[PDB]
């Protein structure tokens, strides 16, 4: 077991301790700077009915509301559900989204 | 069972054709329907091949329908082929619907099978079993083996929607 | 053994020895 990453697998810079979050899939405790974080904006009605709601609406000029959700998962759940992948040694250095 | 998969105009004076109907995917959609029934008939295993005999078998089942319904035998055949064949199937089994060529396939197959099972170990001949099968499928009667098989398939399709 | 449980076992052993030596 040598060192695998320069950040030790987290984003902790000039502090001793950080907050705890609960994984939204399995509910384990994870430090906040380690948890995998994604933000999503979606429509409350699925796009496959997004025009039939609209055509059956009495209010003139209505606009379909949206949902704003920040999903946070642990390492195990992120790998299992394919939010992140295991990468090659060269590829691990890439930070591009 | 559509007009685009039941071939009427391509028939000959007897169903024998020596045709390579299964060399391509959709070629058999232009295969004459009485010959398709003839091909299904010689499917017991001790009767593989033996097409010359099956042509007689079907041929003498058209002089029984003309003497009972009083109508054209080929027409009642088309009616039986259309009536049989599940419209809905089940394949965590969820419901799906069936293509035309498969509806025709399963229909012809179950008519042949019904006659086959009803003639084994019986005095009654296999040709006059085919007469019963064809005249009873085309109507819709529950005594038809193809219609009961269809109903079973559609019930299991409904319970899996 | 996992070293944590070996330590637990050893602590139970030492406490048993102290209790037995307490008599007399």
């Amino acid at each position: 077991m040598p060192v695998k990453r320069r950040n030790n697998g987290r984003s902790k810079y000039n502090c001793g301790h950080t907050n705890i979050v609960r994984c939204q899939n399995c509910h384990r405790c994870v430090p906040k700077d380690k948890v995998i974080k994604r933000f999503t904006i979606r429509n409350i009605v699925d796009n496959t009915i997004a025009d039939d709601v609209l055509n059956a609406c009495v209010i003139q000029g209505f606009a379909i509301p949206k949902l704003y959700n920040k999903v946070q998962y642990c390492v195990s759940c992120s790998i299992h559900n394919h939010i992140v992948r295991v990468r090659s040694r060269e590829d691990r250095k890439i930070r591009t989204p | 069972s559509l007009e685009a998969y039941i071939s009427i105009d391509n028939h000959s004076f007897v169903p024998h054709s020596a045709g390579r109907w299964s060399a391509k995917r959709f070629r058999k959609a232009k295969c004459p329907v009485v010959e398709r029934l003839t091909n299904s008939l010689m499917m017991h295993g001790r009767n593989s091949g033996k097409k010359l005999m099956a042509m007689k078998t079907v041929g003498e089942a058209f002089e029984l329908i003309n003497l009972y319904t009083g109508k054209n035998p080929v027409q009642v055949l088309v009616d039986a082929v259309a009536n049989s064949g599940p419209r809905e199937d089940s394949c965590r089994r969820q419901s799906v619907d069936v293509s035309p060529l498969r509806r025709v396939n399963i229909g012809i197959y179950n008519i042949a099978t019904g006659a086959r099972k009803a003639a084994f170990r019986k005095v009654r001949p296999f040709a006059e079993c085919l007469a019963e099968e064809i005249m009873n499928a085309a109507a819709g009667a529950d005594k038809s083996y193809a219609i009961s098989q269809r109903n079973s398939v559609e019930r299991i399709a409904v319970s899996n929607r | 053994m996992r070293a944590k449980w070996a330590k637990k076992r050893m602590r139970k052993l030492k406490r048993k020895r102290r209790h037995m030596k307490a008599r007399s």
Binding site: - | L2, R87, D89, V96, D97, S99, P100, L101, R102 | -
Partner: protein, 55 residues
């Protein structure tokens, strides 16, 4: 009361073993799964138009 739909095009093999195919039929754009060999402009007998195929 079953209805007659008509395949507008073929989208691909769905199940883990081939089998069924996803098709667009038709004034709608309903997507459904079929077991048999479907070409274009085939007529299907739908028992209901209510259910739509996944994905």
């Amino acid at each position: 009361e079953p209805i007659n739909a008509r395949v507008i095009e073929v989208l691909g093999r769905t199940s883990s073993r081939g089998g069924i195919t996803q098709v667009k039929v038709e004034k709608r754009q309903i997507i459904r799964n079929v077991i048999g060999p479907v070409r274009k402009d085939d007529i299907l007998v739908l028992m209901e138009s209510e259910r739509e195929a996944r994905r």
